């Protein structure tokens with residue numbers, strides 16, 4: 001009875017969805033109400049880092065729910081303290097604020113940057129972000145998101161934001177001034193179609209932020225929590241931000257977000273910012289379980305090997321298939337761009353019809369975002385399914 | 394063992410906390426790491442509607458976690474669809490959008506209002522909200538939040554917001570214009586110290602929104618989900634908004650938020666707004682469990698009786714204790730205001746020392762926000778403990 005053909009009318013029409021009602025999932029597979037199995041190379045849009053309903057995650061959720069779900073930030077709880085320690089120790093050693101989502105994490109970052117700048121000067125509230133970036137949908141994050149189509153209906157947005165071309169050193173440099181309090185960057189742009197930063201570009205952004213006394217903020221909501229083959233992309237690049245935001249895979253499915261700051265950026269005082277749900281024991285328990293799994297000896301090294309193997313197969317496909325214009329990415333975050341004559345959305349629909357789930361993105365791309373636990377055989381099955389789709393496109 | 398005495402070092406200093414690490418809770422009671430039991434009249438700030446770790450909620454969480462935690466809004470899931478149906482049918486019959494938090498629900502409402510306004514005119518983007526309101530900390534919601542102390546460090550905020558005095562018909566009338574797309578009101582202001590709207594004031598807001606073609610938006614994040622003795626406060630008042638926002642108690646401790654719209658306010662299109670985590674099956678399963686419990690025959694009527702019983706005891710206390718200036722609220726949302734010579738924060742600390750947890754708010758108040766499952770004897774115990782505190786204050 002409860003099915004998308006019957007219950008759609010209770011939901012606002014905010015999404016373009018594939019026509020499936022999913023009721024059960026394990027690992028890389030998800031099942032509709034009829035028991036049809038789908039190979040899930042979406043991971044819920046880069047969230048299901050350990051796949052669906054991973055047994056260790058499920059056991060931690062069950063255990064914690066029996067003990068304490070929510071107490072608020074009037075008090076301290078053990079999962080929140082443990083997760084803050086683990087995030088600090090596995091990054092650049094700073095302090096943590098828990099939010100519930102990526103956009104909320106980025107909003108906290110914006111607020112940190114504004115407070116940092118305002119201490120120096122009332123004029124130092126400008127924020128730079130990239131054209132084609134995606135930082136979230138709440139109004140602060142939406143102003144940072146360098147995509148007019150998402151902004152226009154909701155204007156006027158937050159004053160003081162300006163945009164530069166991703167990977168264009170000189171364009172970033174020429175937009176800097178002493179009035180800038182932060183530069184926001186995705187180390188790999190996601191929604192725009194999987195576009196890795198060059199190391200030179202990130203190194204430049206770091207130097208500029210140092211020269212103009214601005215905070216360098218890396219949005220690792222999509223590329224973070226193991227997906228590049230290191231815990232965070234910044235660790236692959238060797239460029240350390242002042243502020244790092246994370247969400248998506250942090251909870252392995254359970255909603256959570258976080259901001260990590262160095263001492264320079266540790267500017268918030270009691271009352272400046274907060275959240276009812278953020279830092280709750282249930283979500284933080286999930287995050288503890290996830291970070292412990294990802295940091296086990298050898299886990300990330302095997303993600304890197306799997307990323308290399310998937311990339312090799314897709315590069316072979318790119319050479320062979322004239323409709324494939326480009327393949328790019330890092331680790332298990334990979335975009336496949338098609339020639340203009342072929343619709344990315346049609347490719348995704350045909351994949352879906354053949355029981356493979358992929359995520360469309362800009363620049364006429366689909367994204368392969370499998371769970372980090374994805375098996376070599378599942379990688380091959382996904383590539384073969386995509387090839388079969390392209391043969392008939 | 395993990396404890397706030399050490400682990401505070403990993404957390405940003407964004408909160409003024411009571412000095413307790415809590416590890417376990419059931420019902421109206423929460424326990425520290427030493428096994429001391431505290432009577433929790435915070436409900437995690439109006440969140441734990443069924444108390445801590447209610448067995449039916451816990452069972453639902455465990456069952457859903459074993460099945461499917463997160464699939465994203467690329468697809469449909471049964472809990473999301475069921476919860477949307479239940480929210481629609483138990484309110485004014487509209488459509489639902491799932492967010493993760495109160496602030497995110499209010500951000501969606503702002504965006505709905507702007508989309509609505511822009512259909513009529515490019516100038517019709519202005520939003521009105523009340524002085525001393527609280528709508529959230531993300532930058533859209535923060536602009537709606539009528540509290541300069543929370544805004545100033547982060548300016549400039551979103552242009553086009555203006556404020557009026559809560560319960561002041563003349564001030565609301567003055568601020569209306571054809572360029573207003575929404576009026577935001579908490580039916581009972583929470584953070585300001587539990588200040589119910591008058592029915593007259595809400596009826597006037599409804600008439601004015603009709604006259605100026607604006608959306609009336611009720612923020613029921615704190616007063617909703619059963620706390621006033623009806624599912625939503627608007628149902629006690631008999632004034633129906635165009636848009637309703639809810640979070641906190643919706644998930645019984647699991648993070649979730651929602652916006653409900655009538656057809657007039659049903660204006661978002663695919664791509665206009667979205668969220669990774671919003672509408673996930675785990676959180677929506679919690680929401681289904683909660684709404685089914687609250688809507689059981691007699692449940693809300695008993696919340697009303699308990700509210701009346703608590704209010705009677707507090708009114709007797711007010712008459713008896715000169716340091717108590719006022720008691721106000723509705724159902725189990727109650728504020729106790731002290732004479733200026735007595736610090737609400739000192740009262741809350743002394744309650745804490747005597748194993749009763751309460752939530753400070755504005756206007757020199759403490760808030761009693763017990764779970765809606767609070768027992769009559771627990772009510773008496775809280776009141777007796779408070780009285781003992783006031784005897785030595």
Ligand SMILES: Cc1ncc(COP(=O)(O)O)c(C=O)c1O
Nearest residue numbers: 101102103135136221222668669
């Ligand atoms: C890089 C990036 N930042 C922020 C977000 C927003 O995260 P959320 O949907 O959890 O609010 C996303 C999700 O699309 C993202 O890809």
Ligand SMILES: Cc1ncc(COP(=O)(O)O)c(C=O)c1O
Nearest residue numbers: 275276494495496528529614615
């Ligand atoms: C009336 C009201 N609106 C919005 C919010 C913000 O909710 P959240 O902390 O879940 O973002 C709250 C919480 O303080 C609330 O009391």
